[PDB]
Paper text:
In this study, we investigate for the first time the conformation of the protease thrombin and its zymogen precursor prethrombin-2 in the free form using 19F NMR. We labeled all Trp residues of thrombin and prethrombin-2 at the 5 position of the indole ring with 19F and solved the X-ray structures at 2.3 and 2.1 Å resolution, respectively.
Extra density detected at the 5 position of the indole ring in all cases supports uniform labeling of the reagents used for NMR studies. The presence of well-defined and separable peaks in thrombin as opposed to prethrombin-2 suggests that most of the Trp residues in the zymogen experience a similar chemical environment. However, this conclusion is not supported by the crystal structure where some Trp residues are exposed to solvent (Trp60d, Trp148, and Trp215) and others are more buried (Trp51). In the case of prethrombin-2, the W215F substitution affects both the large peak around −47.9 ppm and the peak at −49.8 ppm, almost 2 ppm apart. This suggests that Trp215 exists in alternative conformations that exchange very slowly. We conclude that prethrombin-2 is more dynamic than thrombin, with most of its Trp residues in slow exchange between alternative conformations and experiencing an environment that changes significantly during the conversion to thrombin.
Numbering used by the authors: 1C, 1B, 1A, 1 to 14, 14A, 14B, 14C, 14D, ...
The structure:
Amino acid sequence: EADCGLRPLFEKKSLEDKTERELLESYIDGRIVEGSDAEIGMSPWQVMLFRKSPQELLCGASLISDRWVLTAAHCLLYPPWDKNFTENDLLVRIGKHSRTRYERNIEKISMLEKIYIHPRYNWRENLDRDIALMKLKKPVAFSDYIHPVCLPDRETAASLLQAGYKGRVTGWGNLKETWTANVGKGQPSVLQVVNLPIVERPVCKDSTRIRITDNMFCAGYKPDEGKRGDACEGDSGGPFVMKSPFNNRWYQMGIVSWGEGCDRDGKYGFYTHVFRLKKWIQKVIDQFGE
């Protein structure tokens, strides 16, 4: 996709969002608070996966072209929970800011032609190769509020996905809503944003009893320096993104995966490693698109 990762309301208008410079500088401030309301059009690739009947937010997702949405396999297929969705059970909403309000003349509703799950998706032991693509029935029309994110190439993945560099989780707290012991505060009313440092692989592994695959990375602050930035502000199967200092473009480096780690805030967020699985993604796009 030629235009990917340049937002109409930012890169295309020479405007910057409130925290992108802190990402590009990999700066971690002394401040405690991180997880705030997003600016309109800050995340124009942001997608909601909704159940047809009754209407409910199942998951997050991301727009990668006019016909292609990316999410987590577990959003579509989780036999232990009796979760098994067809194209027909689902729609997506693209361009949203408000969690609850129907945003007439801004948001678009699409149906799915087809669902594709990584043939080596494993829900049994750990959530390995937790990735899926959804083909829209009809191409969606890009707008100020609807624009695709880039997927990384080999050099962008090596360059951006490194311990101590800073990436971005956007969503409507659907991960929190799914996994929260108690619903204390309610779900956010507007799109949330949080910037999270990528964690050393060995620190990730020691943090959990889940067998951490190389198909996964993790991000978040040490409990030691207590921060209010919460991954659970993210949506299950939603985007983890980074800005390239080389071409000024937003790349999706991760998918919000399994969110059992969410419950006690001494753990980190676990993300599917997009570039690791790009051969499958590109094969599906090349062979089952146009």
